[PDB]
Amino acid sequence: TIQLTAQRKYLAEVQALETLLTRELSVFLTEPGSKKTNIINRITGKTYALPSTELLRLYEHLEQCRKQGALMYFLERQGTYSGLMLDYDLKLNTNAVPPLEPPALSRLCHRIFVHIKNSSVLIHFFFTLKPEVVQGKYGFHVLIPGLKLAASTKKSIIGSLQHDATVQKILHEQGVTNPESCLDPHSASVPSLLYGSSKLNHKPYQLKTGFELVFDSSDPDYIPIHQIKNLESYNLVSELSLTNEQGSLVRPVSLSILMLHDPEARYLHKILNLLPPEYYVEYPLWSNVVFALANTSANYRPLAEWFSQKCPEKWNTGGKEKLEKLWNDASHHTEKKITKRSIMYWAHKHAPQQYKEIVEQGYFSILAEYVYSYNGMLEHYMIAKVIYAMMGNKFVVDVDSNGKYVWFEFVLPGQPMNQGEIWKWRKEVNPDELHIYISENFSRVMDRITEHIKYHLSQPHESNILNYYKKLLKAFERSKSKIFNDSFKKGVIRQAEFLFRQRSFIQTLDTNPHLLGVGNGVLSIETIPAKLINHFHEHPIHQYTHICYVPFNPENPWTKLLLNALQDIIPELDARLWIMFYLSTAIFRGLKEALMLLWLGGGCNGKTFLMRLVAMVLGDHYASKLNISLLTSCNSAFMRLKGRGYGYFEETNKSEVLNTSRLKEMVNPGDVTESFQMTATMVAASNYNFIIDTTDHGTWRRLRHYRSKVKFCHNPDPSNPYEKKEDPRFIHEYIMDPDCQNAFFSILVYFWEKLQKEYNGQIKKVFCPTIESETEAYRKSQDTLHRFITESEVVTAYAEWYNTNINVKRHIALELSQELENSVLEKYLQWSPNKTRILKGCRILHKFICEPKNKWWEWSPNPS
Amino acid sequence: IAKVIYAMMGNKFVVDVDSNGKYVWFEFVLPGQPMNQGEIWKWRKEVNPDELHIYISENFSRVMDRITEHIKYHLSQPHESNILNYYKKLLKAFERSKSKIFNDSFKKGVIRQAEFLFRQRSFIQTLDTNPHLLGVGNG
DNA sequence: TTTTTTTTTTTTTTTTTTTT
Ligand SMILES: Nc1ncnc2c1ncn2[C@@H]1O[C@H](COP(=O)(O)OP(=O)(O)O)[C@@H](O)[C@H]1O
């Protein structure tokens, strides 16, 4: 990795090889599966079928790049005609080199000559071996490219040598404990390696001896195996090539493509291998990770498929086909977009002490490649990319309506913070902790590079590469200080805000109505029971409340006090259940029914006590007070309740008259207007009474009413259930008590769960005998024209009656005729020849249920 | 220099962010210093660090003089050629950077780093929350 | 003299303010 970039840097011949491959050998492309190719680079798996000219040129260039001592991973495959290539997996007892002798090698040459004379015959012998010092000794490859007899005869020779005992005896003389299995039967059926072609994470072979032995068809009995002199004068790479017939010295007698494609694929491979496959075993978590990877692009379909082969008993007959089914589902899925952050968190949880150094090596290699690319001159983007690599799941950047860039940070426990922000996101204006991380936390990692370079400077090298390393260190010393310059940090931040940008993040914030932020995390009320997330998540939550959640415990003394006081406020069990059910829906933030709740009382009743408690429990984020002038009037006023699920009015003190206007506009769940939506529950209470003049069929259907039957005063009235001693403590205090608020929140969420499980989230399903009884009584009331009848001249007289009875105001006689006709005067209606609706039979007088056992919150059975 | 400021002279000032987003400073006054009348032992709001500038220029220079004389002393000690050359390069670099403390741009950079290092979360809102504390002209 | 020095640039602001 690092050495690859180094060699690409301080070796011009490597650059020449790269240019030759990219320009000249581009036209010589070969299919990966086609066998017409002759050269395959194990680095990139590029199949090539170079002609003789390209073959000789590449042989020469590889000869040079070998002769300085570089590294190369090119391989050749035997064709229809080829020389002899052999493998000896000499797994000796000890990894100690025996002094193999040239006479012994000549005896081996005689043995192989005997083994080949009993075949088709009409030679240079090269012995190369590993640099040794490795378990089970080294491996040996004799190379004989002189002949061309690539056929099953090679298999026959391999078999003949397999049972050969002379070679085994020679090996035993060389102290080999493994006389057999060193020569694999598939030696000639696999591609070979050119001289200097090392194995992956291994070292290239080095030649040992070269012996020239001519042959004669008439009588090969004479054998001059006499040693070759001065092999260095020849291009050994070209001479040793099987496909090279024109040699001078010699004579012619899909996981891989995924790992090759970008490093993030293999990084995901590693991090997926880090955690145990136990989570993969079960369907839920495995499907979760498949969905998560499918959300992040679609190229990882084989990658997940690669992860699918594990547990074949669960993969085949099941997992295999459901894998592609889930992939097809996720290709169009839009409900959730889990990303690699969850996988990183899982690797954090399950397998510690290892992913730290793994990612450290990863981004250290990234930064080493960066610094190598431009010789120690690093700029704002150059550091900013590594910074993005550092904290990829900690910060996010978005653009507001004004266009200003704004940051957001995922507050977690164990860091300095405010009260009630753990495990959830907070807005932020100018990255502060990012600056310290850049200047200090990052500073350690690059220090590693420093010593790393010094390490490579400590090792002996050539003068030119040593001078290059000295220049690299000198350049890097200048960039050393720039981690502290403030203009440098400002430029780094300005560059990085582009990298950290995430499109469509502010507008999708808080869009889930079932997710509510609390003092100790976030609650998802999507399912029953609601789930508290006290760990990493992937949800856009910014609004919250400072009320910590506790499980609904009726055994809490404060819970008992709240239940008793709430029962005392309105003793009617059915009415109490209905009103608590209505109030428990304030937590929901989605669309709701077009209803408002208003209820009246004489005064000094249970009003304005539970109202303010509910308001403060919901909080400023989720609740908003509203002025009474919203409905009594004939625009920041309408901007209220944006996302707030609870709307309420203060005490009216005096009496007010509704204008019949904006009433339908504040209740409908449709468009109201800029355009915005309304999702809130409306609750109103007053000491006095209102005036309503309308009898539309839609109206009085989208409306409810109630009257308080209790009275609270300082002097108790004995034997009167409708009077109880007011408890000032309830008001002045019992609000600031955090435990009281937590218990109240638990009680409200309990009633919300009860409503969801019983009536499936509809207030229409739940009915109270008291409700729609007092409501219909009020509906029968608030009628004036019908009352006037039973008490242009008719409409005029109605006008003065209304003025002198309730209120004096301007009147319009055009429409009032319609309600007068629709009144009880329909039967007493007759027409006129002048097309006028004159009146007959008229004369203006102008002369004078059940109770709970011990738990009303138990809600009783369905009738309640 | 900002970390040195935080360490040496850090228990006198606090930095916070207002609603408008402008960074603001607060200082804990002590007896015997220029100030207004009758506010001793309380916290004063302040816009752009003034006494911090004098502290950086005067006290920090005195401290770095100690480092300078320490380096000169260890240079005076007998040593090999390589370590002597290393110390000499340190000497030229440090004396070239000595006068940089008085740069107004550098000083403002130190201030804009201090406004990050000296920040304390949840400080403006926690001011004067206790109803029982009443500031008076004598404390 | 040439390689190196070196070196002031730069930076900051300056102006932007942005403001009702
Ligand atoms: N369930 C209850 N038991 C005892 N006292 C109560 C109960 N509910 C309310 N109270 C008290 O009765 C008083 C009624 O006055 P208040 O609610 O202020 O009248 P209004 O709501 O008309 O302004 C309150 O001070 C409250 O403390």
Automatic annotation (TrEMBL), chain B:
Q: What is the lineage of its organism?
A: Viruses, Varidnaviria, Bamfordvirae, Nucleocytoviricota, Pokkesviricetes
Q: Which family does it belong to?
A: Belongs to the asfivirus helicase C962R family.
Q: What is this protein called?
A: Putative primase C962R
Chain segments annotated as coiled-coil in the UniProt record: none
Of the parent protein, the shown chain spans 418 to 556 of 962
